[PDB]
Symmetry: D3
Subunit: 182 residues, 6 copies
């Protein structure tokens, strides 16, 4: 079961893409399978995911994965802590960093720059109503540009969406994730 | 004047974006400020409009008004000025009922909603406040209200998207168009 | 229906409503809810009028702003409608009403206004946790101790109003929605 | 000090305090805090006496119990002290005062008293979420619509009292601590 | 009914004889563990060492932490029992009341304030403790061992509150009238 | 390679002997035992309570109890305990995935009705212990737990509410060995 919801054969272009996934990764990420009932939806998801997590940014790819895990920790999202926790381990080379981010980032002995980024993602996840100029000013003082700030917010905001889709439908992450990068 | 509290530079709009905005303006009589926020990268703008349109306007077992109701209920919980303004105006427009618009912004429990609409909005509230605690009984209750698994998917997506949207606007102090306020009163 | 709960009005109350209808273009629905007991109606109108229209270091708009911000946290349909109308009216600024109903942090308020609303928010959300630095912060913003009293009382009062309205499902007048847009 | 906030009492206020002293053994400090404006003092005592002492399908103990349960959620030192002593005095059971102050769920109340308190808790913690089902639970426990009003009103009022007290750090009289032990 | 969930051993009978003579009652919490003498011993040892052992915190400091924590958690048993201890140790019936109710009304020193504010945050939001929180305790006049002792006292009452809560453990009637 | 953020020395010979028995049985000395080793009386009292509760006779299996520990630790975001007891769930279940699920969100795990009722009670005792009523015990009994089970469930949940708070307060650090174990 990739989820608790019941939704056709895959379209030719999704089979093409999934082939690519299986060639590059060992596997087709289950989130893509969840979306595959509707190619418009699949394509719009992959378009945003890739721009946000892989696009050009002052944040590294690992920065963004660390934001994704921090937010997914607060929300207790099993799919995302699994998939993106594997990504932190893999991108960092540090199996322990992935566990700490999954459990409590305050445990991690992060740099000031990384702390500031994650503390903002925390407030944005927990109490969006309360974000004020002082919260932006804290990121600037940490050395982030305003476009960096856009990218931190966008990433944190995105995972607030991803967590809730996954929770809503009980989406299951690939079993291969668990053993990777340990 | 500023559409957000970030201090962004920007170059010219691409000719495709100028055209696209010419049509927003021709149609809606405004270019929604969120679109202007994403115009620094046509890549992002296209991503945004694709997801928004499929979500809010594509085929669904949810009417367009149901989805604007989910948008506003979620935005009410998170106290999102951008979204309450913009989707509040959409609810008043689509229903033809300015008071309904106001109830959803303030407290949807004050509106005389069908059991179906209540079940939908109560799921959205739980997904907004405590996504860790969603269980099969939550989905079971939507099914008792008549929703298909594809509908549950659309409710969850709509509610999810607004949790993202509210956070992007909150994080950067995004400013809704002044014109929304007076519409459909 | 003015509420979810179930004879004739008194002559004093029938005449009180004649006047409201003259001065305002309507009888506020809260007055009709209390109308089953004139003792209770008089008590309410006495506290309401002293708090909102009486003497204070706060302007009447300052107090309507506090009312809306508290009602916003509590999601009170009656009070957001009624006092939102009042902010639109007193300020001449339809957008300001909406900001206060939705999120006051979007509004471009003075430091004094901001200080006043942040206190009303803490008193609404965690009154257990008020400490002397909450009072010290009002003083820095320039509030006397009597202004602090008035802010506290205005905020406390809509914590009661929000809860009566919510309990009984009290309905605001339709005309409020169209007003001052 | 009776609060953390900074002339003479009026003649009628001095006479009223002399009478309190005789009838109660003390002048309630809340009355002293209001004594800077007799209008406000009056408004306070009118609403208080009507709510707490006026005719209702709720006993006087029922209403003090609501008061203390609200104050306990809000951690109001003034009200837990003053109304806790009221519960102890009216019930003649010091243990019951304690339970209500600490956690009413330990008390072993009737199904009626538990229905009433569960509604006051919800109204206190999440007024945004009150629905018809909540009023329907009161009816099923035997309350008339007018009791529902009185229950709501009592709980609403103490959400205002708790906040005025907390905002200004209002201090209860020392004598309450030893009362009815 | 000490709770909402028989024969005592001879030692446990002896031990209850000394509490009786020393305290004027047998704390109900002891009666609730006395179905197993080794769980009773385990409890008494940890309890005694915690509240009565050598520490840079006073016995009263520790009893105040117990009450502030119990107040946040609304624990009838521990508010009653440790409220009594605070009244008795301090000599001040009002102080016990203030901590049961709201310690911010209490007029404590900056050192006592820092202590209870840390115990509060640990009770409410243990996920968010940080070095700045420990640096604020040092600033208020606490050692590293005093931080361990505060944390352990606060942590223990977070367990006690939850066992009492879970089984509806009832405090002794006699606590209520004491040191008033 | 610090066991905590506090200024915490020279172990007694009995304590060193016990730690060798730890290496022999566990492959490591739990850092929690090192934290307590400044005083053997405290170390002794901790080991006594811990072992009775986690290993002593009980209607709950050892795994049942490690699951209550991880579920509580998950709510409180306790890095020490999620690490140490996450590893114990993986080791006792032989199912790496189950350890992850309980650390992340137990509602994802394919638990029996009975197991779910247990964790649901652990959750409420963790989040809102003021609100525990007879109806919460009744639901455990409907799930088929005895009252001695209810007590053990409550004691286990309670205990980790303390353990998490001591760990968080002093920044106690779990052994790096835990992270690779039973994967």
């Amino acid at each position: 079961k990739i989820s608790a919801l019941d939704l056709g054969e895959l379209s030719e272009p999704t089979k093409a893409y999934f082939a690519k996934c299986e060639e590059k990764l060992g596997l087709v990420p289950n989130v893509l399978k969840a979306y595959a009932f509707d190619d418009k939806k699949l394509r719009a998801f992959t378009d945003i995911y890739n721009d946000l997590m892989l696009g050009e940014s002052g944040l590294s790819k690992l920065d963004r994965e660390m934001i994704a895990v921090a937010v997914s920790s607060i929300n207790h999202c099993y799919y995302c802590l699994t998939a993106h926790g594997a990504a932190v381990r893999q991108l960092s080379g540090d199996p322990a960093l992935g566990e700490m981010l999954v459990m409590n980032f305050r445990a991690a002995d992060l740099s000031p720059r990384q702390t500031a980024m994650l503390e903002f993602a925390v407030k944005l996840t927990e109490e969006p109503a309360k974000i004020v100029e002082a919260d932006r000013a804290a990121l600037r003082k940490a050395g982030f540009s305003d476009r960096d700030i856009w990218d931190i917010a966008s990433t944190a905001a995105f995972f607030n969406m991803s967590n809730r889709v996954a929770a809503a439908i009980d989406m299951r992450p690939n079993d291969e994730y668990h053993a990777m990068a340990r």
